[PDB]
């Protein structure tokens, strides 16, 4: 058996074909087992509609998840990603920094 804690990165991207649009991303990488719970949060509340959830694996024991959706960050509100995994005794919340 192997278990590996996810690395979690939270960032924003504009798709080059539609640069006025902005996407909030949570990239959860290198984890095992694959069982996981991932949410995007706005003011601590689960964003119910997340458009994209892309899961892959490299080696049989390393999984990668890109979880992302369109958003409009203003100076109002706080955004984050929350991850639950067997390796994490408490949920891990990683805040989005507007500079990322």
Residue numbers in the entry: 0 to 99
Paper quotes:
Here, we report the use of the TPBLA to explore the role of the protein sequence in determining the aggregation of the naturally amyloidogenic protein, β2m.
To examine the structural effect of other amino acid substitutions at this site, the crystal structures of seven variants (D76E-, D76A-, D76S-, D76G-, D76Q-, D76Y-, and D76K-β2m) were determined at high resolution (1.15 to 1.52 Å). Comparison of the crystal structures of D76E-, D76A-, D76S-, D76G-, D76Q-, D76Y-, and D76K-β2m with those of WT- and D76N-β2m revealed no substantial differences that could explain their different stabilities and aggregation propensities (RMSD < 0.6 Å over all heavy atoms). For D76N-β2m, the network of hydrogen bonds involving the sidechains of N42, T73, and Y78 found in the CD and EF loops of WT-β2m is maintained in the variant. For other variants, the loop structure is maintained despite these hydrogen bonds either not forming (D76A-, D76G-, and D76Y-β2m), or being reduced in number (D76K-β2m hydrogen bonds to N42, and D76S-β2m hydrogen bonds to N42 and T73). The native Asp was most protective, Glu and Ala showed some protection, and all other residues (including Asn) resulted in a low in vivo growth score when introduced at this site. Six substitutions are observed at residue 76 (Ala, His, Asn, Ser, Thr, and Val). Interestingly, saturation mutagenesis of residue 76 showed that these six substitutions are among those that have the least effect on the in vivo growth score and on protein stability compared with Asp76.
